[PDB]
């Protein structure tokens, strides 16, 4: 199978309940860590018998409830929320924000977890060649940290190709974040997750959307046979459905860590959506 | 595939749950906008993995409930209803109006969405050559806006070939509306939609009609195999199943915008059906 | 194809779910109206894409439930039932009447509509040459309307060749009704209809009869392939599966209308079956 | 084709689902009635379009359930069962009686009717020359009706050639019954009937026997092509698959009717099998 | 054709689903009974129209299931199993015993019966000249019935030519059993039988063996044409496919019956295979 | 015909589904055993009626599945696999290894057995004169068993004519193995076997190769007539299609058995292909 | 027979399914390699028994599918496609390109291989005298590799006799390529190959063309006898039907290898057809 331990993660564009254009969390990025059934040196893989099943149901009354339901599946190591406008750039976040503004409807989220294994690290890491080469091209200073820098977070959101930004090294830092994300996975449960978002008016007006992580693309969620076939494909293509992350600056040389932290703060503001 | 972004739309004759004489919404009209996987300049196309699945169920107690269920899939940009006798000239609207008048039966609508991609524009447009040539033949004044004009909306409904109307420029304006519609699509979800309208008496008397948007014509809705084959054809022939529109007068020169707005108001009254 | 718009219809001998000796409703009669894809002057034809599919299921607890299920597919213009012992002379009506008398069984009717087009008129008609010549041979008076006329409805049912009837003009009127029916079709949905009448005892004792309208004769209803081939023949030979009728006396000269109405009343009693 | 209207019928040896040594009901006997597409004087023939299809399924828990399933297809005029040990001398009855005694198995019967026409009489009949000559040789008294007659029903079952019986006229009466039966057909549906008797143990142990009425002998019931070819031969050789009978004594002179009724009662006991 | 009524039958070496070295049951032996379309005195022959078709399917989970499936086609008169290590010396029994020991596979048996006639006796028999002469050479005592007789069943299985056995009359008795068997057929269905033994692993690993009784040798079971030609040869060479037997000692003089019963018990142990 | 009982067998070069350069298994070697319809002393021959037909189908997902499908037809006495790189030097093994490496295709194997007889031995054998003379020329020691012997299995694979090997007795042992093989047949089914290896891409892209054992060379597998003619030649030239073998060292004097076992181990490594 | 091992091959003009003007691949060129049943030094020849039969079927939806079906039979050593506009100058490629442009038809390719032997080399080669003399006349530089050289690939396609090209050494290099090709065969299967290209409209409109490699010219593909006679001639005149090639520059002196590679690139562009 595919190893997701040590994968990069964009906390702003991520969404741990899924995305219609991906079979997994849209924030997962190429592998950042390099490793040595089989146990990776410095970590562990614990395989399950069939699928470890769990279900959750939540009434999502506001954006904060939705944020909390996502943070449960994509948090910092230990369970604390990532914060910093996490998930706010994903399609699912913008879709729910529209529905929760309508005070005439109420939405519920029903998660169904189909976990197949758990993996994690415990801590002297080596990064991939791609990540190391990317880091070697980074400067030691983030230009937008300077006060009255022409390239602000608002300027980047409006036009990143403007002269105010293309003269600074800000585009170099953002290209790095766009490639590898802002965090990386240190612990994960992999398998499948089928989530139903059910909206009821205030007429038995009910709407249901299905969001799927893991396995092969499912043809029909309402078909009993098509749902069962999807779970059989989850064994073949398991993907992270609940994970914990560590900030990426821990993997950079110390002279670049402060600039990268400023870069992800800039990135969270320019790409992330505050509730406005 | 076929581009439906920028397609004209007749809000009066349209019906976003379908029509037995069309594989799509019968209000979709030839392309009005001209554009430059591949991204259109000024817009975007977001392709999905397999099909983005959603289902809705609603009890349709009166004509207003049916109107609301259609407006969900064909609205103004932002979600507001088009209004102005929208959908009232379609076959499906007249069929449901007959069934809802019978107080001894109750009808439910079950939608099944099979969305394959999303497209939209964000706003300096260029129209098609057909639309530009059509606009160049339009006058600057709509004759029926003049008080005591012999060609009224009622006169047009009774006999549009009468001398009262053929002397005015009203037939020229209506031929334009009949060709391109009254609005145009600015955002759309494309794919397939299978809707069941289920009517129960007050005897297990139950009637079910199937209405299909998108894909190839389905041979048997009750056959499990024929339904699955239809979804496989939805990948090949996706069509708009939920979209948002902007009024067409925004695309006309300013000296003709006021006359066109009067023309669509006239058109909505003469062709559209008030609940009488 | 064959035009059924304006066809005569015997409401007493008709049966809109079918007959084992006909591929269509056994009450359909030769064309009464003459007309001028292609649109008939004074009417319309609306062709469908593939087949417009609808299904109904009903528990038939008594003869009235069966009558209602037939009246749905063969009614007066507007939806009102024809009445006047409608369908009571058909084989299917007599078959169901026998089964419903057995209180130890319960019967259900499952309709499957495969509609291919809709046609209708809106109202100065011209009748066929056969119908006009038939009308010219009719008297102005119906003899059995006279009190104490020897030829009563009971006498006609027992022996129509008796002297009591052969001396009156009653046989002339009945020969006209036997040729053209009592009504004529003004609106129709054409295609195919497969109806299952399922009877369950009170042992999994279940009986199922198949009744077919439209297309070519089907070899095996249980064969999946033979059923699909039948639908392909429905495109070639579509027939009325749900229609609305107008009384034939509207097409006769005024001096003969009252006598014809008395003739169809006589015909409905002598040929039709009251529930005895 | 061959006329079966008015055919004699042995209710004891008959079996309306078939017999391996006959292509039809083994109780059908040579024609008893003589008659004058073409309509027989005093009766009717109603030809079907293709085949009128019906299917039945029944769980046969005991001998009474099997008896009821046969009586459905061979009953008295009106639907009442013939009774009097009907069908009990047929091979199929004895075969099923053996299987139903095994309480470790369960048997189901699946009938498939392929009806091609219906025929019947309504009531002054004339019998065939063979039947009239047979009746002329019958006595006016049945000897075994006399109390303490040496030739009893048990004596006939043990040895009909014994002196106790050969001295009476009992062998003359039984030879008549053996030639023409005990009843005669007054109404019938003709065509084909394929019946499956499926027995399941309590291992997927399932047994299926095929019993066929009508058409040409079928080579392979499991072959799809061989089954379809059989139905094509049903058009050529249709045979009664569901019929109603009247007792034969109605066709005898009154002075012999009472003796014949005693003869068929004797015959039903001596040849028929009580459940012992 | 060839008469199999009264044929000898070796219950130990027999196998009613067939043998690759025979066209029939390998336990059928030369005729033991002598008899006098045509009906044998004391018995009956009932000829079928074409072929009486029946099919069975069974999952054979252990040796007992296989034994039961064979006993269905070769049993004592009345249906009771023969027992006494029946069928255990046949090639097919040893082949299946090997496959059922593999717990990683599952085997199914599919029987297809093509019965052409039934024959039987009801009970003063006369045996053939060969059988009578064979019986006249038999002693009145079976030597191995004596306790501590050197010729035991184990000794016969190891070396029947040893001095321990050649001094006794045991070889005389076994030569009789080897010629005529242990039972004889009293009732039989004759025709053809094609049986498929299908073994599936736990990869779509499936194995199928074909075993044929009756008719001419079939060239290709997978060829549709070669299978149909085989059935045409079944009419020419019908053989017993389901029969009932009676022990042979009923045909011996009373002074030899007890010794013969001991001989068949000895034979069943020495030649038959207990599940070890 | 030709006796294959006691034939030598090269387990490394063998392939029981065939070879394009042989009409039989390419591992069959000249006769090793000498023997005395007709029964060989110490063994048996069981002739079949026509052909004993069996068919198998298997999806071959990896090299292990292919190995298992061959081991079914060429195993140790009892059914255990030979192992020791069996079949790995055959052309068919190398061909399949290439196709299974392509993860974009899937291959199935369809076997069709046409068995004509079975033969075997039960155990004091005498070998042929050729085998005895060959054994007399063998040393008592295998030189490559000595540690740090210059002639290793790798050295033999690279250049067997090098000085490192030509000085040892290794070439003498390998010439013996090349002549007689490593095992010998103790039980066999002889006849014909036609195997189809069908490869499907992931476009209906399908490839099929035919591999034939037994009979005369077939001109066209797709021709129905040419296939039937091949089976007629299988009767004339039957060859082993499923057999069991015993190691050859059992036939050597005890002082040479250990050296021969080391020789076949050396041979299996130098000539056989490990999955690299 | 004729040796094709080491034959030159024009990858641009070649076509491994055939050509109407050749009995073999039209890209095969005279022998380039010189060698020493009989085994060539440095290579091998493996003769088959009769013909090794294989069949393939493929739906050719676009030019890429056709390219893939040819590349299967003419690839680089190892199976990788040659590329570089391979096969694009052959008649068959241009014929199929015309048919695949018609979106109203669908074409399938059915290959039938009749392989008689396999040959190959493993690697110090010696070339033929013709090839060596040809190479000695080649320059060390390819003139068209120089930027702004008047003789471009387009100029060569339009007029190779123009002054722009006749002044350079380009015609010398192209004459060499035209004589010996661009690659040479290192491994081959020889025999016959009959390929059917079947085109169906969307009326049972079907077209079939036959393309033949190997043997003598066949008179009638539809004649069963003429097809069989062709296979008998395949034994006499076997030709390569599936082969692998190595680039010719490996056979040139190192000082000319770079210029020859530029020459074949030039040749592939000037003679080969890009999909325009
Ligand atoms: C990668 O890091 C591990 C410790 O996590 C270390 O054992 C290993 O040596 C490193 N890789 C290499 C190639 O040395
Ligand atoms: C069409 O409009 C786009 C902007 O939407 C513009 O870039 C383009 O130049 C216009 N078309 C042409 C032919 O110029
Ligand atoms: C038939 O009636 C139509 C109107 O329904 C009329 O236009 C036409 O003239 C009539 N037929 C003829 C032959 O005039
Ligand atoms: C037979 O009976 C019919 C009435 O069922 C009668 O009309 C006819 O005359 C009779 N046959 C003859 C030969 O008279
Ligand atoms: C054979 O036995 C039958 C009774 O089964 C008997 O009728 C006949 O006489 C016997 N055979 C001879 C030759 O007598
Ligand atoms: C060959 O061996 C058999 C036993 O398998 C033996 O009977 C025979 O005597 C041996 N051959 C000779 C020539 O003795
Ligand atoms: C040709 O090359 C071979 C090796 O492939 C070599 O053995 C031979 O000597 C060469 N030809 C001549 C004439 O030497």
TrEMBL record, chains A, B, C, D, E, F, G:
Which superkingdom is the protein from?
Eukaryota
Residue limits of the MACPF domain? 1-276
Tell me what this protein is called: Perforin-like protein 1
> Which region of the full protein is contained in this chain?
465 to 800 of 1150
């Amino acid at each position: 199978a595919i190893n997701y331990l040590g994968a990069g993660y964009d906390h702003v564009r991520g969404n741990p309940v899924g995305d219609p254009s991906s079979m997994g969390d849209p924030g997962i990025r190429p592998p950042v860590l390099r490793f040595t059934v089989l146990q990776p040196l410095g970590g562990y893989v614990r395989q399950y018998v069939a699928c470890r099943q769990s279900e959750t149901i939540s009434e999502l009354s506001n954006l904060s409830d939705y944020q909390n339901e996502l943070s449960v599946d994509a948090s910092l190591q230990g369970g604390d929320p990532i914060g910093l406008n996490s998930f706010s750039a994903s399609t699912g976040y913008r879709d729910f924000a529209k529905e929760v503004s309508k005070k005439d409807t109420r939405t519920y989220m029903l998660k169904n977890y189909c976990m197949r294994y758990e993996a994690g690290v415990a801590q002297k890491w080596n990064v991939t060649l791609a990540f190391a080469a990317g880091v070697s091209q980074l400067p030691d200073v983030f230009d937008a940290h300077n006060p009255e820098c022409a390239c602000s977070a608002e300027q980047w959101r409006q036009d990143q190709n403007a002269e105010a930004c293309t003269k600074t090294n800000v585009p170099i830092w953002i290209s790095f974040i766009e490639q590898f994300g802002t965090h990386f996975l240190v612990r994960l449960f992999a398998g499948g997750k089928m989530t139903y978002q059910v909206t009821a008016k205030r007429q038995m007006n009910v709407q249901k959307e299905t969001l799927v992580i893991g396995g092969r693309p499912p043809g029909q969620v309402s078909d009993p046979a098509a749902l069962a076939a999807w779970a059989d494909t989850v064994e073949e293509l398991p993907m992270p459905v609940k994970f914990e992350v560590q900030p990426l600056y821990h993997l950079l040389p110390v002279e670049k860590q402060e600039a990268f932290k400023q870069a992800v703060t800039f990135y969270s503001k320019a790409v992330g959506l505050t509730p406005q």
